[PDB]
Amino acid sequence: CFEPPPATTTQTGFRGLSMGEVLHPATVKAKKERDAQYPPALAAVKAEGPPVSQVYKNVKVLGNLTEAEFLRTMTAITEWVSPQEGCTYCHDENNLASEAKYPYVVARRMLEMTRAINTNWTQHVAQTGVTCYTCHRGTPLPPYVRYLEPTLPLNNRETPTHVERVETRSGYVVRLAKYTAYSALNYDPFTMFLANDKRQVRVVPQTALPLVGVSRGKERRPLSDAYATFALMMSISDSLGTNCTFCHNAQTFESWGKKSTPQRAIAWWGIRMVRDLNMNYLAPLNASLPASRLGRQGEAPQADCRTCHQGVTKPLFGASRLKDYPELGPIK
Amino acid sequence: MYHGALAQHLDIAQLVWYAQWLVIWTVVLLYLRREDRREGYPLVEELPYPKTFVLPHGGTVTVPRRRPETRELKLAQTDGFEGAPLQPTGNPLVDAVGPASYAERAEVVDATVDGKAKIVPLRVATDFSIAEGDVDPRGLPVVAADGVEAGTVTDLWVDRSEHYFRYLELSVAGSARTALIPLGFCDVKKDKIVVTSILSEQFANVPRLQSRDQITLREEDKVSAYYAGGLLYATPERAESLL
Amino acid sequence: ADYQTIYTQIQARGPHITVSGEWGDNDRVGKPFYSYWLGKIGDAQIGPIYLGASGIAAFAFGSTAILIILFNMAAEVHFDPLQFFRQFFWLGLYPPKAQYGMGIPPLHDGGWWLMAGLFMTLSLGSWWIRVYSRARALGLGTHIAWNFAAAIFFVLCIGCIHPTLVGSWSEGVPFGIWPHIDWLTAFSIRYGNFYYCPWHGFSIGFAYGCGLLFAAHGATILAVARFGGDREIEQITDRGTAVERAALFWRWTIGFNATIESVHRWGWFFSLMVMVSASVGILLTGTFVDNWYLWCVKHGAAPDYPAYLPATPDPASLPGAPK
Amino acid sequence: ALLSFERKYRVRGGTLIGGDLFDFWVGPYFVGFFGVSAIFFIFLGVSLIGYAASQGPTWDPFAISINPPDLKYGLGAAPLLEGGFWQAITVCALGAFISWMLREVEISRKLGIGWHVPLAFCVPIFMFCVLQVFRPLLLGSWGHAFPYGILSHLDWVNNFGYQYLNWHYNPGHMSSVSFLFVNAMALGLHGGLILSVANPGDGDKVKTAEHENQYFRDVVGYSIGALSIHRLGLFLASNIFLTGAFGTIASGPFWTRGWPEWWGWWLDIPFWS
Ligand code: BCB
Ligand code: BCB
Ligand code: BCB
Ligand SMILES: C/C=C1/c2cc3[nH]c4c(c3C)C(=O)[C@H](C(=O)OC)c4c3nc(cc4[nH]c(cc(n2)[C@@H]1C)c(C(C)=O)c4C)[C@@H](C)[C@@H]3CCC(=O)OC/C=C(\C)CCC[C@H](C)CCC[C@H](C)CCCC(C)C
Ligand SMILES: CC(C)=CCC/C(C)=C/CC/C(C)=C/CC/C(C)=C/CC/C(C)=C/CC/C(C)=C/CC/C(C)=C/CC1=C(C)C(=O)c2ccccc2C1=O
Ligand code: HEC
Ligand code: HEC
């Protein structure tokens, strides 16, 4: 019901502005323990010999690796994605060139997506980068995904109650609330802002006075847009385990420069990255997945901020395997 | 173009801001602060035109009151600075100075909406009673600040307009008289009424009513003021610093 | 201490009083009853109550609004009674989410909200006539009705006048516990931080000031209750020591004072101005100011602070940045 | 310089400390020991505000701001330019406010009236202490306190709120707000009532105590009464802060999540989840 002190507090603004993080030490410790399960990098191996483009039959993304390097990637992918089932989660055990199991074809696309994040979206992931583990955390289905309607629990490894299930209509408002940090905002910010690039998050004027021609009647955006933006911000705050002041001086949410932190610009790039992942890599996978993986509108599961971040301002507290697995990007 | 924009770097909200402050300062300084001066002026040692009220039971009053008579104050200056405090020259309780002071209210009985005496003992207000659950103080002793019994409660005086008790009346031991005390100066217990504002002996000089079963507005003031005086004057120590 | 200022030690009971009004005496309903525990800190008498046409109309119109709101809330939980009780504070009836301008919106997207607002407006107008007319029937001034009028006007500004001035019903206040609260932030955000609206500041100064004034005046009268300071009407017409001491307490503390009549003018005015100031701020918002923080920067009033973390350029402006 | 009825009340007595030494008036102002101590702290405080303000960027009254130290200074002394002025001014303010209260006690005693006003004034002083002293002590830095600037203190309030995502969902805030609003309404109704009785209009008769009770019995079915509305107004106003203080002190020291999530105690009960 309450959280016992001490609280951990940081400062993100000029003294006297009450800007900063507010953290519960036991909560931070528990997330650190969970994130520390990240398997360590595999031992380095032989860099010389022919490329597997020559050695194997059906290697389309990782063709420039040596055999030892390529089998190291396969070992790593297995631990990160399908450790309980092993190689045969994706492979026909009698023919490793076979693409007959749906996870194989998905994993090839995922290799391309991972390389794209680490190559094309350094404005977000920097030199920390992502691996399969960042999202998957040891299971074929990542624990935090989104459909085109809100779903509970947020962590799909938990069993839902009857009222949490998406088919139970009476539970809708709670499904929405638990995605916007318990607010009553009547908007799903995943489908509005993160599934694609159709909407503008910004709602605040950049002039003192109302501009003639955009400020009256149907010229205007409805006030609903401002509630939806607040819902997205509530959801992002909770996804990172943080508050508005990590990114903004609330004096003026719409101002950059001294009124925004460096982390806000990183967040902006994160929105763009997530939209690219969803539109171009994840949504098209509905054609490759079984019916049982799809939502009620035939959609594949997609990513939001929580998919990687899982309640921390940096996924896995900034742990990295980038230099350990150069084949996941950045690709030259 | 912009909605609200005027010639210069002026805009409509900007002009409204000046207006709002002008209104507020006008209301405060030219209206409210003038209403504040309808009592106590002219000052001793910008004014509004007098205000007349038509009274509920006939007649009018114009405020501030000008009284055809003037009371003598038994006070001596303690020193000669403009703002030095004054000091009693007799018994301040009986002389009614300082916190024992009363106002020259009308010598008329406060009335109910129907024209009856408003504040009356229960011996008169025979339709009134004490709520079940509360102490009936009649017949209980009154114990003064010195722990000495000053007398015995004889009646309660009720406000017939608000249905609320305002005074107790007690017989004053040894003095062949009764006295009123406002209930605000009474700690009502099951076995006694405790009064810490005055000492037992000081009950003998409580202002007397002209009539046994009614009280004037001025008499109410004289009665209440006497006990308040005790807070400062019941003993010599009460005027000195607490610490 | 004056224990009477804490509670009534000895309560009085007498025949109930009825003051005749110019009309309506036969429309008072209820047998009064007495609460001993309430009588410790107030009058023990409860009832009777006046009916009358404007009160009955208020109840009918208001009940209609309430039923529209509740029915829509129930629909929000698919009419599950347990979920209604659980989720109640999160449920609401919303203005239109799409931009239809000043078009009467579809029932399913703002229409029922506009209808509830109409019946709520009729209810408030009906109640106003009751508050006004009861004062007249009893030969009293209409000071309460005019204060109540400012409060109603403020509700009309946020409910329909602002929406009409900008031309969009989407900007109205939702019905519901959390949802009407959610609006405060959406509206502040949209219009560039309400902390920077001068009229928001005026309203707060007056609202805080009502707190200051009721504490001070409430306490002052309790402090002079021993002299009958609570009998304020005859203290006005015939000044007694209660309000002489009250005035001198303030004169000696702050160097000036009021009268027992004029303190009530101060309080009435402060209360009125919470609502008048809020209304003027709302009427200027969207109409003539789009971003209050930037309007203050324009006029050189906004505080500025040094960077703590490094100043951060808008990445949307970077060369080749996506939209 | 005196009201017409004032002379008979200007007697010696009622002081808490000092005796006759400071028992006098300057114009309409009572002095006393706590008058002297209040002037001392006001003079010191306002002098520090001037000196501090002259070292800053601006003389515009809206934009001036005297700010507490960075969090990293903890509860220690900070350099004068980087939080120390704030610290010194906070001490002066508390000195001034408490002096003001105790002076009101002296004035009350001299007039033979109750001490309800200075007791009531303890409430805002307490709330200042919650914001500036108690909460910062619990979090372990003076830097959590609010800055002294007409507009800057609103920037603090604003960021503080949003550090808990939506402060409107703070239960102690909800109580505080409800009291603010009911108090304002009740002051309107009370002021209005009294004026309506004493000012019926035209040549009409002033009305009565009975008419006041009739008005509210007719309109809402209950009249609280003429003494009781004064106790109620003091209760309502006081509870703005007395309940708010719990919401302020909770935020950080006893709750680190957003405020809306606090309501999971209710929403997340297993039998209706
Ligand atoms: C947790 C929330 C807080 C808060 C939130 C807040 C809001 C949201 C708003 C204000 C506003 C105001 N606040 Mg602030 N506030 C203020 C003072 C002020 C005034 C500048 C102004 C009007 C207040 C008013 O009329 O009240 C009622 C009292 C009345 C009517 C009597 C007159 C008081 C007088 C106006 C006070 C003037 C103080 C000056 C700055 C002088 C400072 C002293 C000098 C001599 C050194 C003080 C002196 C304090 C102290 C000592 O604690 C304080 C604490 C807080 N305020 C907390 C931090 N206040 C409003 C404003 O317009 O700010 C720009 C406003 O919108
Ligand atoms: C993040 C969002 C913020 C916000 C957003 C905000 C908005 C959008 C508005 C205000 C407004 C106001 N704000 Mg602000 N605010 C306030 C204080 C206030 C109020 C004094 C003032 C007027 C509102 C009022 O009294 O409503 C309470 C009184 C009401 C609602 C009157 C109701 C009267 C009605 C006759 C009652 C009817 C009852 C019936 C029984 C109903 C029956 C219904 C049935 C039939 C369906 C403080 C003290 C603070 C602090 C300390 O931070 C603050 C911060 C904020 N406000 C943040 C900046 N605030 C208003 C204003 O001044 O704007 C310029 C306003 O519109
Ligand atoms: C985005 C942020 C928000 C926010 C953040 C917020 C915070 C962080 C806090 C509040 C608090 C409060 N807010 Mg809230 N707020 C409020 C209302 C209120 C107040 C009732 C309450 C207490 C204010 C206080 O501490 O004053 C303090 C005033 C003081 C201490 C005055 C001290 C006076 C001193 C003793 C004497 C001063 C004398 C001068 C120096 C003398 C000058 C000399 C001259 C005059 C001669 C409303 C009505 C709204 C609306 C309408 O939306 C709102 C929205 C918001 N608030 C936003 C959601 N608010 C406080 C609370 O209780 O929260 C639970 C609080 O901590
Ligand atoms: C719930 C309880 C309520 C309540 C109750 C009561 N309120 C009282 C009494 C009661 C009973 C009195 O008896 C007393 C008084 O005499 O009344 C006329 C008083 C008073 N309430 C004042 C201000 C007030 N009440 C507020 C709030 C409530 N009041 C709440 C609502 C607010 C808000 C809300 O912001 C304000 C600004 C003064 C006018 C007066 C003290 C003067 C003083 O103490 O003189 C002594 C001190 C000075 C004259 C100046 C001191 C300058 C210092 C050293 C330097 C400045 C430091 C400062 C910290 C900088 C801030 C700047 C920045 C924020 C911009
Ligand atoms: C010159 C010098 C240095 C002298 C030294 C001696 C000394 C200590 C002097 C003090 C100098 C100082 C510090 C002065 C500043 C005084 C202050 C703090 C003034 C603040 C005034 C403010 C802003 C007040 C806010 C409240 C307000 C709006 C009040 C206006 C209405 C009034 C006056 C209400 C008081 C009042 C109330 C509340 C009643 O109920 C009542 C009932 C019956 C009769 C009269 C009254 C009455 O007068
Ligand atoms: C899905 C997550 C996989 C798991 C688990 C394992 N492998 Fe894999 N394998 C996968 C893909 C998408 C591909 C093609 C990669 C490309 O760049 O296109 C492969 C390929 C192979 C091959 C090459 C076979 C051939 O084409 O002749 C081999 C020999 C191989 N993989 C081995 C292997 C082993 C030993 C694994 C467990 C340790 C293993 N894979 C797991 C997808 C996935
Ligand atoms: C988050 C941004 C991800 C990263 C990085 C990687 N994957 Fe992923 N995966 C992600 C989502 C949102 C989904 C759809 C949900 C689903 O479980 O189907 C997937 C799916 C897969 C699958 C199919 C699992 C199944 O349906 O049984 C596989 C085999 C897979 N992903 C593999 C994979 C690999 C090998 C990765 C690194 C190279 C990798 N993923 C990264 C999200 C994310």
Ligand code: HEC
């Ligand atoms: C960083 C991790 C953020 C946190 C935490 C919060 N916000 Fe944010 N905000 C962020 C970005 C990157 C953007 C711009 C997005 C884009 O695509 O352009 C925003 C935007 C806003 C806005 C709109 C500003 C405008 O120009 O119209 C608002 C009103 C806003 N954000 C508010 C807000 C609130 C209330 C937050 C906490 C609940 C919050 N934000 C958190 C980045 C981040």
Ligand code: HEC
């Ligand atoms: C995995 C594919 C991610 C997704 C989806 C999102 N973020 Fe991310 N984020 C990711 C990494 C690997 C990093 C570390 C980069 C580094 O500099 O160490 C980050 C970092 C951030 C940060 C910065 C935190 C800090 O610097 O202290 C922010 C503010 C952030 N990410 C925000 C954010 C948002 C708002 C997202 C959804 C829109 C989001 N991220 C998705 C990886 C991934």
Ligand SMILES: CC(C)=CCC/C(C)=C/C=C\C(C)=C\C=C\C(C)=C\C=C/C=C(C)/C=C/C=C(\C)CC/C=C(\C)CCCC(C)C
């Ligand atoms: C049964 C018991 C006894 C009572 C039940 C109480 C109850 C549960 C009520 C319902 C749930 C609750 C508590 C809801 C609360 C909602 C709240 C707090 C709402 C607050 C504010 C809403 C506002 C200001 C809306 C204003 C809307 C308007 C002013 C609309 C105006 C529209 C018009 C004037 C129409 C003119 C235009 C024309 C074209 C039709």
Ligand SMILES: [Fe+2]
């Ligand atoms: Fe009063």
